[PDB]
Design an enzyme around this catalytic site. Sequence first.
Site, short mmCIF file in Angstrom:
data_model
loop_
_atom_site.label_atom_id
_atom_site.label_comp_id
_atom_site.label_asym_id
_atom_site.label_seq_id
_atom_site.Cartn_x
_atom_site.Cartn_y
_atom_site.Cartn_z
N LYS A 160 -8.47 2.05 -2.83
CA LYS A 160 -8.25 1.68 -1.44
C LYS A 160 -8.10 2.89 -0.52
CE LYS A 160 -5.21 -0.56 1.85
NZ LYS A 160 -4.19 -1.59 2.21
N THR A 201 0.87 -1.18 0.00
CA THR A 201 0.00 0.00 0.00
C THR A 201 0.90 1.22 0.00
OG1 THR A 201 -1.82 -1.13 1.12
CG2 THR A 201 -1.81 1.27 1.23
N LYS A 210 -1.57 5.08 8.90
CA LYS A 210 -0.74 4.96 7.70
C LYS A 210 -1.55 5.22 6.42
CE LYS A 210 1.44 1.64 4.63
NZ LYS A 210 1.70 0.20 4.34
#
Lengths: 291, 290
Positions: free
Chosen positions: B168, B93, B243
């Site tokens: 996402k 990610t 994050k």
Amino acid sequence: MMTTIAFLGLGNMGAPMSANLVGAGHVVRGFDPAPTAASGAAAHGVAVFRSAPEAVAEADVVITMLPTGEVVRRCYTDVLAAARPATLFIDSSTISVTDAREVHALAESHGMLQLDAPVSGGVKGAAAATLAFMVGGDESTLRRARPVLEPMAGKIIHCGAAGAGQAAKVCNNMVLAVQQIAIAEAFVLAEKLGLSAQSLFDVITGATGNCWAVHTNCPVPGPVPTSPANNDFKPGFSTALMNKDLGLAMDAVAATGATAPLGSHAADIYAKFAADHADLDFSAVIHTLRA
Amino acid sequence: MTTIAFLGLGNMGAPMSANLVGAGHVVRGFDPAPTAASGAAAHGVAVFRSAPEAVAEADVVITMLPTGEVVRRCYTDVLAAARPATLFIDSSTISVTDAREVHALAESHGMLQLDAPVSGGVKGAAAATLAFMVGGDESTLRRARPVLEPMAGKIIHCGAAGAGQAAKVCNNMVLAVQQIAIAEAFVLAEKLGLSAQSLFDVITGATGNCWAVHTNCPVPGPVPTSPANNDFKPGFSTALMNKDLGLAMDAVAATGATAPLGSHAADIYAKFAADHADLDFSAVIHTLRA
Ligand SMILES: C[C@@H](CCC(=O)O)C(=O)O
Ligand SMILES: C[C@@H](CCC(=O)O)C(=O)O
């Protein structure tokens, strides 16, 4: 179940609600100080009276659908003495939790049963008898009220003691406001990242972010053709109405000392947006993020 | 038999690579932590001392790495060692900007490349129920599908390169806002004298319903499995949510986007992560008076 009902407030919600009560076979005795509202309600079978006290005089149940807590308070002050003892008062207005508890106590001090039963569904829900009533007060009083509420309702949910109906509605609609802004932010950011609206829609709706503000109220045209974005942001749920509810949430936050950072942020955003776009669906807040 | 180089054998990478071994693939591995490497070797991964070595014989190269910078440096380290038309899948990610840079870099060497970041966490990785959100060519995804399937519960094509990362990050920004919003609603309800169960029943049957309440309810009782009933054990940690929100804020900066509530949520969670990084993100309900 047949009952004489006084209906105080025959506006955009009160008129269709009252028509459904007439359709169910109740005798409805109406009052509204706007003669156009009164006339329209009379056309669908409400017996319209000259004053609110006259309307309530011969009623088993008194329903109020009024714009503010001040108007509910003033109405109760005008009519409670006129009502027969142990009459059931149902306030389906959307007002502050503080005002609801005040008017509830006033009604009870006059020997009347009282519930707060604010509704969701808007005018369309009102016409179709699919409104959700969120009720605060005694369970036995709700039991007494059910036959009257059912012909106007899709759902009746008991939220707790007096004021809990207002509390539940205002809490849900604060979350809704925050979600509708957040979904709008997501769609505009997606657009600037080169992620298509249809793609983001498919992901969010398939994922942990899904909510009515996207799956039903999608603020970009295309993925949900029935959403207001496809119809020039015609309400739907107007910015004016959402701004009213956020004002009531901010009243609740102030009365409790609660901390609601995003809820308060959403209130400030909708208050600014309402200044010039009160008439647009609340999903139209997406316009503030584009530039 | 497709041979897969798996670069990054940490919390996510290790179970993912075990599922690939379990599906009949030859898995070659690299990780800089001996414990991660050893644990992966223990379930069938042939571990190599350097990433270029792992990649040498691979038809597919999968990265699961902590940052775009590390992903970028891994690519420049290994691309020359890779066979032509190797399929590269980054399931790290990272920022959309970094994703598109590494994609371009890989295709410049005649490689095929996808961004395929995942949702589901370690639980999902182990159970092979991860949701892959994929950016890249449809035909490259089709080639990748046999490799992704044994790790995956869902595979969603999001668009061109970077769209996996974008999808996402956008969903997780909404989720953070929703989780805080639900917490505020429950605290306000309590102070109004409205019970948690009553609020729960109303919201879940009304327009405000979302996963943050119906599954992650931040007060104990209404959803017995929610982290609130188990000392806010993740679940989805504040550290990880923090994050993702950092990446959302990078994307907001890069694009010049207006994201006031998402940004506010990012501020709230960054502050909360200073104290409670190890708690489920729903634990934010108890930091609102800060
Ligand atoms: C039965 C129903 C009311 C009647 C209606 O559907 O209009 C209810 O809310 O329980
Ligand atoms: C993710 C994939 C299932 C593959 C599998 O996990 O065996 C699918 O349903 O599209």
